[PDB]
Amino acid sequence: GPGGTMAAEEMEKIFRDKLFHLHQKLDEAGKSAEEIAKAVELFVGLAMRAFDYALHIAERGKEMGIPTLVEMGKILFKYGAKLAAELALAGKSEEEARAAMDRFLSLSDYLLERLLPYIELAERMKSPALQELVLYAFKEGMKLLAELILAGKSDEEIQAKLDAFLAGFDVAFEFTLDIDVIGRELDIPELVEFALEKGKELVKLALELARAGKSPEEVKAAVKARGEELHKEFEKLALKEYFKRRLGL
Amino acid sequence: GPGGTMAAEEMEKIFRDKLFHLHQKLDEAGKSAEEIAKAVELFVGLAMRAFDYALHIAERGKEMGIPTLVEMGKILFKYGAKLAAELALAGKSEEEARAAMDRFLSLSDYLLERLLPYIELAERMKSPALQELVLYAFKEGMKLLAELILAGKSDEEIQAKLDAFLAGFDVAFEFTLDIDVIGRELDIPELVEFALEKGKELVKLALELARAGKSPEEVKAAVKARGEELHKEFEKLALKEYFKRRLGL
Ligand SMILES: [Zn+2]
Ligand SMILES: [Zn+2]
Ligand SMILES: [Zn+2]
């Protein structure tokens, strides 16, 4: 509506879209009118709490000097609205839905606290690629957290999976930072693009490993091996680009 | 009647309506002319005492700065006239009916004295919702008292039911006031309407518990639990309305 925050308008658009598509899905599923009304009110109730939490996070990011936290808040609201829509569609009771939303918010806070130092490190070196990698990691962690909360998992298994995912993300971040520093210093955008793409690949691999239930050590080892292979590919690409630049090509 | 106070005209209208419908009921019942005459004279005799007592209460309220007492006197007269009509219809003699009317008046005074501090507290904070809540509680107490007097109950059980009802009304009043203060301060009429409706619901629940014979502690516990549920509902509604206002909707 009129007179709002730049971050709040996007969240309002997301909420309206999710409500419209939830009504569409309820109509497709063929439910009674009272069931549809119950699902709609439950979804609105949960989405308001998710909206409040995400708006608080975005405002906290705005008050500091961290523009990344605004995007993290928007991502958090998007996936909280998705979780609320699925909870309403599944026909869960009000108390169970509220408890699930509370657990989701708490574990998202956990992931945010674990990811903040990486945001500080990325913003210290003024690396857009590192900030993009952190945002991608937060998005993947939000996906995994929402799926696990939907599946009905305890707060310990989810925390262990998040720990394994962060163990993989540490290696992915180190790989991306290494490549990106030399890509920026030598003034070769192809190296930066390679860094971002292969860091995203490493983050995807780490998330897939964490979902399978591996310990953080196994995730670290496998992400390290994949990073070594991608580092060999980077060596080839860097040699090619440097010789393109040196010869005037 | 040409001339008289504002509160007296409404009471006269109530008396005429009750007399007319009592005559209709007597005609429908198929009673002798002498029985109809004795019922009419008994009803008039009891209604005159009820009218005098309620008018005295109304003038007492009018002398001070308490407009609520005028409405409470009108309610007292209405229910006293109803009780007189039932006594006349039941064929009770001139002595048992008079004793029942006297007991009803004494217990109405008891309820009035117990409800006066809540009237003072409501008028101190200038809250129309709390005034309506006190009026509704007085009406429910009048209903219960008239029913118990007609059923032929001693002054001990009636009094115990009265304190049980007042124990429930204390929690109802606290809940309504807690919601109403924040609803008025934030300027959201929906919150005040919700407060009034849920306070009325809590008063109804307290009256139902008192009628069944539950002790005041059980009534207090049940009303407190229902208040917790309605408080969760209020939290949801307040969040929704606050986000409607903040986004310009
Ligand atoms: Zn808030
Ligand atoms: Zn290197
Ligand atoms: Zn409250």
Helix, strand, coil proportions of chain A in percent (round to 5)?
85, 0, 15
**A174-181 contacts at long range (C-beta below 8 A, 24 or more positions apart):** A175/A199, A175/A202, A175/A227, A175/A230, A175/A231, A176/A129, A176/A130, A176/A133, A176/A202, A177/A121, A177/A125, A177/A127, A177/A130, A179/A234, A180/A127, A180/A129, A180/A130, A181/A125, A181/A127
- Among residues B204, B189, B225, B56, the alpha carbon closest in space to that of B136 is found at B204
The two tokens of residue B32 are 């002798």
Q: Are B127 and B183 in contact (CB under 8 A)?
A: no
Q: Is B243's CB within 8 Å of A4's CB?
A: no
Q: Are A52 and A80 in contact (CB under 8 A)?
A: no
Whether residue B248 lies within 8 A of chain A, CB to CB, comes out as yes
Experimental structure resolution, Å? 2.6
- Among residues A12, A15, A13, A24, the alpha carbon closest in space to that of A89 is found at A24
Helix H or strand E encompassing A74: helix A68-89
What are the φ/ψ torsions at residue A6 (nearest 5 degrees)?
Answer: -60, -35
Q: Which bound ligand lies closest to the C-alpha atom of B176?
A: 3
Q: How far apart are alpha carbons A108 and A148 in whole angstroms?
A: 12
State the alpha helices, DSSP H only, in chain B: 6-29, 33-63, 67-89, 96-124, 128-151, 155-185, 189-211, 216-246
Q: How far apart are alpha carbons B244 and B249 in whole angstroms?
A: 5
Residue with tokens 């407009």, as numbered in its chain:
B67
**3-class secondary structure, B11:** helix
The two tokens of residue A42 are 């439950």
Length of chain A: 249
**B112-119 contacts at long range (C-beta below 8 A, 24 or more positions apart):** B112/B57, B112/B72, B112/B76, B112/B138, B114/B162, B114/B166, B115/B72, B115/B141, B115/B166, B118/B169, B118/B173, B119/B66, B119/B68, B119/B69
Residue with tokens 């008018």, as numbered in its chain:
B55
The residue of chain A with its CA nearest to that of B229 is A95
The angle subtended at Cα A191 by Cα A188 and Cα A197, nearest 5°, is: 145
Q: Is B247's CB within 8 Å of A48's CB?
A: no
The two tokens of residue B152 are 């032929």
SS3 sequence, B206-234? HHHHHHCCCCHHHHHHHHHHHHHHHHHHH
The CB density around residue A117, as the number of other CB atoms within 10 Å, is 9
Q: How far apart are alpha carbons B22 and B82 in whole angstroms?
A: 10
- Among residues A206, A193, A93, the alpha carbon closest in space to that of A141 is found at A206
Measure CA of the first residue to CA of the last residue in chain B; give whole Å: 53
Which residues of chain A lie closer than 8 angstroms to B243, CB-CB? 48, 51-52
The two tokens of residue A191 are 């190296």
Which residues of chain B lie closer than 8 angstroms to A45, CB-CB? 236, 240
Q: Are A223 and A199 in contact (CB under 8 A)?
A: no
Whether residue B239 lies within 8 A of chain A, CB to CB, comes out as yes
Measure CA of the first residue to CA of the last residue in chain A; give whole Å: 53
Which residues of chain B lie closer than 8 angstroms to A3, CB-CB? 247-248
Q: Is B239's CB within 8 Å of A2's CB?
A: no
Instruction: Point out the residue among B239, B246, B249 whose CB comes nearest to the CB of A49.
Output: B239
Using CA of residue B120, residue B124, residue B126, residue B130, what is the dihedral sign? negative
Whether residue A44 lies within 8 A of chain B, CB to CB, comes out as yes
Q: How far apart are alpha carbons B163 and B207 in whole angstroms?
A: 11
The CB density around residue B245, as the number of other CB atoms within 10 Å, is 13
Residue with tokens 């708006």, as numbered in its chain:
A55
- Which residue, among B228, B231, B233, B236, would best test binding to A if mutated, counting the most A CBs under 10 Å from its CB? B236
Residue with tokens 């919700």, as numbered in its chain:
B194
Instruction: Point out the residue among B236, B240, B247 whose CB comes nearest to the CB of A8.
Output: B247
The CB density around residue A233, as the number of other CB atoms within 10 Å, is 11
Q: How far apart are alpha carbons A85 and A20 in whole angstroms?
A: 10
Q: How far apart are alpha carbons B225 and B232 in whole angstroms?
A: 11
Q: How far is the CA of A246 from the centre of ligand 2 (A)?
A: 19
